[PDB]
Amino acid sequence: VIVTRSGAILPKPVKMSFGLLRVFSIVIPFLYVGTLISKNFAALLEEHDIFVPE
Amino acid sequence: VIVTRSGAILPKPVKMSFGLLRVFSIVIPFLYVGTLISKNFAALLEEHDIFVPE
Amino acid sequence: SPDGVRVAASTGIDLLLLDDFKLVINDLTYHVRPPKRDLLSHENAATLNDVKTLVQQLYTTLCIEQHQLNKERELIERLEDLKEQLAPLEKVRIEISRKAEKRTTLVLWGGLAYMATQFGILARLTWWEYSWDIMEPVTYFITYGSAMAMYAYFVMTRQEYVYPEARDRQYLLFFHKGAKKSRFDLEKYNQLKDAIAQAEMDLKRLRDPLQVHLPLRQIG
Amino acid sequence: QQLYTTLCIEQHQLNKERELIERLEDLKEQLAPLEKVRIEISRKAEKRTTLVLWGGLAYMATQFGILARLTWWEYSWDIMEPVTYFITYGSAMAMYAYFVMTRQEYVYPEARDRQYLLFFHKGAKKSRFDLEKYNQLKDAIAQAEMDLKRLRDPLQVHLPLR
Amino acid sequence: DDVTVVYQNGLPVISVRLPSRRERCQFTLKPISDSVGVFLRQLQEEDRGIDRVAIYSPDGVRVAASTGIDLLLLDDFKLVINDLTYHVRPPKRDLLSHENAATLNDVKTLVQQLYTTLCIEQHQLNKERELIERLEDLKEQLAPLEKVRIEISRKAEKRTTLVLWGGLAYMATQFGILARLTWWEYSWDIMEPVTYFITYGSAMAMYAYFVMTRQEYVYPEARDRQYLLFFHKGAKKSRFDLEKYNQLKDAIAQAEMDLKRLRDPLQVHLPLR
Amino acid sequence: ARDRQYLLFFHKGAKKSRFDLEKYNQLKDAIAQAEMDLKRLRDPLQVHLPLR
Ligand SMILES: CCCCCCCCCCCCCCCCCC(=O)OC[C@H](COP(=O)([O-])OCC(O)COP(=O)([O-])OC[C@@H](COC(=O)CCCCCCCCCCCCCCCCC)OC(=O)CCCCCCCCCCCCCCCCC)OC(=O)CCCCCCCCCCCCCCCCC
Ligand SMILES: CCCCCCCCCCCCCCCCCC(=O)OC[C@H](COP(=O)([O-])OCC(O)COP(=O)([O-])OC[C@@H](COC(=O)CCCCCCCCCCCCCCCCC)OC(=O)CCCCCCCCCCCCCCCCC)OC(=O)CCCCCCCCCCCCCCCCC
Ligand SMILES: CCCCCCCCCCCCCCCCC[C@@H](O)O[C@H](CO[C@H](O)CCCCCCCCCCCCCCC)COP(=O)(O)OCC[N+](C)(C)C
Ligand SMILES: CCCCCCCCCCCCCCCCC[C@@H](O)O[C@H](CO[C@H](O)CCCCCCCCCCCCCCC)COP(=O)(O)OCC[N+](C)(C)C
Ligand SMILES: CCCCCCCCCCCCCCCCC[C@@H](O)O[C@H](CO[C@H](O)CCCCCCCCCCCCCCC)COP(=O)(O)OCC[N+](C)(C)C
Ligand SMILES: [Ca+2]
Ligand SMILES: [Ca+2]
């Protein structure tokens, strides 16, 4: 809805200050540690001869 | 719902004029330029010896 | 005040006659002594309040139908003045809500154009150049990235990502910059739009005691 | 009309609205100590709700990183595809267990409000806040304002226009 | 010819063909805050090829230049421009202001309200005395029925609880079956189409639920629907009449609503609604 | 979507039969208004009718 019960226009939607930078500063350095965790876990499980595919 | 708080009938819902041809005249040529973008990008990536399917 | 200080202008009269005061006319100072109104009975005054509130209800019905005709014509005159004061601003308001709706249909058609070109990218690259076994995880992470962006929309806007609410939000964000670029005051238009609804809600609250002679309903 | 004058009814009506205005502005006198505590509690409850919102976003990014490393670097997609199906089905099980346990569906702007109310009602008991007196004052002010708005109704003749 | 005016959202406009310019000039008007002389003053501002302008009556007598246009636009009239007399017939309205002269019905409703406000307190107190007895009678008439309705609404709750946890146990056994098949016995190259067709069968069953029950399949509505089905099937095998219980509860609420609607006017001396 | 398809079927049938829908709608609102102000005249609290 874009109006009230009268014809008066609704107020401006409250944007968040630096919203896109606040999302991309919390996605990227957690995606990096999510890469590092899985890399170290795969290497630690491979080195002890438990799961090797090839 | 279909009726008001009394027994009256809600009015006819508005219809976009020639809706399916307006959707299909913007679905088809963007699909075609998507195939063109992907074909030229894969040809460029194969021609510079980066990712060649083998 | 009798110690020498001056009494201010908008001091109530009931506060004034508690103690003495001095009234100064051009050259003369009179020393007024107000009496003490010690007739405060607690008993035989909860029976004076009911008669005093019955006389008010008897006077009200004698003077209520000639009052709600003066108020009716004053409401009609204020309504037809507010409409002529609003009518220059209306043609300016419509031409801001026409650019703000064309910029919203460009977003609504470019979402469909983006989905159709992503379909054409994956359908070209799956059957022609690379196989489906190569191009399956790309589609899966496209799906998971969309399921992550739909949550980032909620984390940034405090509003769930559905289609018409996001369309209305984007429309209002377009309107509140179109109405800022073109030097348009939204506050006077909103107070000229709520005053009309307030003045014509009371006009239909007067339908009861003037058309069918029933007692009118309260505010709320 | 000769009883409306000798009983002094107009000053009685203005005395009545003066009593209503004084009761309204004395109900707002014992509220201003309480909102200084309530604003503090609501602020340090929203500051904890945004923590779990950003934590959920960081968790989804971490799961993206974990499932993106193995399908291309270490293993193949033929190993990690059933794992990433069963993660999806486990999420679909957890969103139903939320409904069985919480008696409401799992959507974002209602889970946020419920979590905010749980944080607020933990903090209001931790700070020994007197919530019931606050709710009684917030009801009584909203009733006294409605009574005052009905007393000075312009379509009635309850008070003289002077 | 200007045989008519045009109505635009409650305001009139006269399309008067001007004398010395061959055009149908529009003229919007405020009916309440304008007179005839204002309209003749601003009609001749347009061309000044006007040597005579006068608004007449249908009978032929002149209309004064101080009567308002709302009093003019009640009936039809004539507008005499300097050679031709345009008969104007505006569209008929119902009412704008409910104002006219005095009537015997007005004084007969005045003594009606003067009779009402002398006896409405001694009638409202005699009605509140009836209400405070009627409410306690209804609330003690209901005391055998609530003891039975609680025992029915506890059986229906303890059955829908088992339906909820049984659905959770089903979607947790399907996980175990599929996770046993894809890793121990068979492989994912066998069990991927069964996974897809189970997902599509669930998406088909959620639409068949909508076709049968005429409502969408969401969780807290599909819980309450099955709860009401358990309640109405359980209250029929216990000889419990809901048509008495429902009319007792709504009658209690109506008496309480009328009590709270009259008791506060006894406090603050305002009208009721 | 079911209710929108129902309204698009009903408003086509009402143009085929020439049903005069707006007289129906204004009568259906007018009898609700006449029952509302009749029910506010038979009030048990307001003494509007004698012998009661
Ligand atoms: C630097 C290092 C590396 C870089 C990494 C990535 C960088 C990418 C950059 C992306 C950023 C976008 C930039 C936009 C910023 C400015 C936006 C703006 O001003 O827009 C004005 C306009 C109105 O502005 P306004 O009135 O001021 O209002 C401001 C906001 O709208 C007010 O909004 P609000 O407050 O109401 O809330 C809305 C909010 C809602 O927030 C969101 O929705 C945020 C969503 C993102 C969250 C994070 C997603 C997680 C993704 C995971 C990443 C995985 C990485 C892969 C790695 C894996 C392996 C390890 O924010 C927005 O919607 C902002 C709009 C931007 C959309 C962002 C979408 C980009 C997604 C990209 C993700 C990553 C890409 C993967 C790359 C893959 C590589 C192969 O805003 C719009 O919404 C309009 C949309 C238009 C968008 C672009 C239009 C393009 C059109 C081109 C022309 C077409 C021509 C046709 C040709 C014809 C041929 C036939
Ligand atoms: C020549 C052709 C002709 C053929 C015709 C022959 C057809 C057979 C005729 C059968 C008719 C017999 C009537 C039976 C009466 C049953 C009444 C009853 O149970 O009393 C309950 C009674 C309550 O009675 P009531 O008061 O009348 O209320 C009942 C309703 O509320 C009623 O009102 P409502 O308004 O709530 O209505 C909602 C309604 C409607 O809502 C629905 O859910 C509709 C479902 C229909 C959708 C159909 C989906 C299509 C699937 C695709 C086909 C796959 C084929 C693949 C072939 C590929 C080859 C190329 O739900 C139900 O009533 C049904 C309950 C659950 C049914 C779920 C069954 C669907 C799955 C069947 C697929 C079979 C897969 C086999 C694969 C085998 C592989 C080796 O007490 C209860 O305990 C309450 C029920 C508790 C909740 C549900 C409990 C589930 C019970 C059995 C489930 C077993 C485990 C689940 C396994 C999942 C499958 C994977
Ligand atoms: C200056 C003026 C600019 C004009 C030109 C602008 C051109 C912009 C081009 C991009 C258009 C904006 C895209 C908006 C639509 C995206 C399409 C998206 O909605 O489709 C989804 C695909 O998702 C996308 O892949 C990810 C996009 C996530 C949206 C992030 C918000 C970005 C838009 C912010 C502006 C809001 C505009 C809203 C327009 C509808 C469907 O996936 P699905 O899962 O099946 O649907 C789930 C059902 N839900 C939505 C009810 C839950
Ligand atoms: C307190 C100190 C700070 C703690 C900081 C650490 C935070 C840890 C992270 C906790 C997570 C809580 C937030 C949950 C975010 C998960 C987002 C969820 O949507 O992801 C889904 C994946 O599911 C998740 O794995 C779990 C599902 C949720 C079940 C657990 C509920 C946890 C709620 C706990 C209360 C907290 C309030 C919730 C905040 C939003 C994938 O999305 P999708 O599949 O497309 O859902 C469809 C969209 N619907 C729901 C609107 C229809
Ligand atoms: C005598 C006492 C009686 C005892 C009877 C015991 C019976 C035990 C078994 C009962 C089975 C009930 C099943 C409950 C539903 C299972 C959970 C369901 O949600 O799984 C879905 C898959 O299941 C299928 O959809 C089947 C459901 C179709 C309807 C089945 C019949 C329901 C009749 C009973 C209704 C009351 C159920 C209680 C609420 C769940 C997953 O869908 P998903 O994609 O992941 O998320 C979609 C989210 N939506 C729904 C909001 C959009
Ligand atoms: Ca898949
Ligand atoms: Ca394969």
Author numbering:
A (entry chain E), B (entry chain F): 48 to 101
C (entry chain C): 129 to 348
D (entry chain D): 184 to 345
E (entry chain B): 73 to 345
F (entry chain A): 294 to 345
What does the paper say about this structure?
The MCU subunit comprises three structural domains: the transmembrane domain (TMD), the coiled-coil domain (CCD), and the N-terminal domain (NTD).
The NTD is connected to the CC1 via the linking helix α1, and the four α1 helices of each MCU subunits stably interact with each other, forming a four-helix bundle that stabilizes the MCU tetramers. In our structure, four EMREs, four CDLs, four horizontal PCs, and four vertical PCs form a cage and bundle up the four MCU subunits. In the MEMMS structure, one CDL and one horizontal PC molecules insert into the gap between TM1 and TM2 of each MCU subunit, and another vertical PC molecule stands alongside each TM2. Notably, most of the lipid chains of the CDL and vertical PC in our structure are parallel to the helices of TMD, while the lipid chains of the horizontal PC are positioned horizontally in the membrane. In addition to interacting with TM1, TM2, and CC2 of one MCU subunit, each CDL molecule also interacts tightly with the neighboring EMRE. Specifically, a highly conserved residue of MCU CC2, R297, can form salt bridge with the phosphate group of CDL and hydrogen bonds with the main chain oxygen of V61 in EMRE. We mutated R297 to aspartate, and strikingly this mutation completely abolished the Ca2+ uptake via MCU. Similarly, P60A mutation in EMRE, just next to the MCU-R297, can also totally abolish MCU activity, proving that the correct interactions between CC2 and EMRE are important to MEMMS.
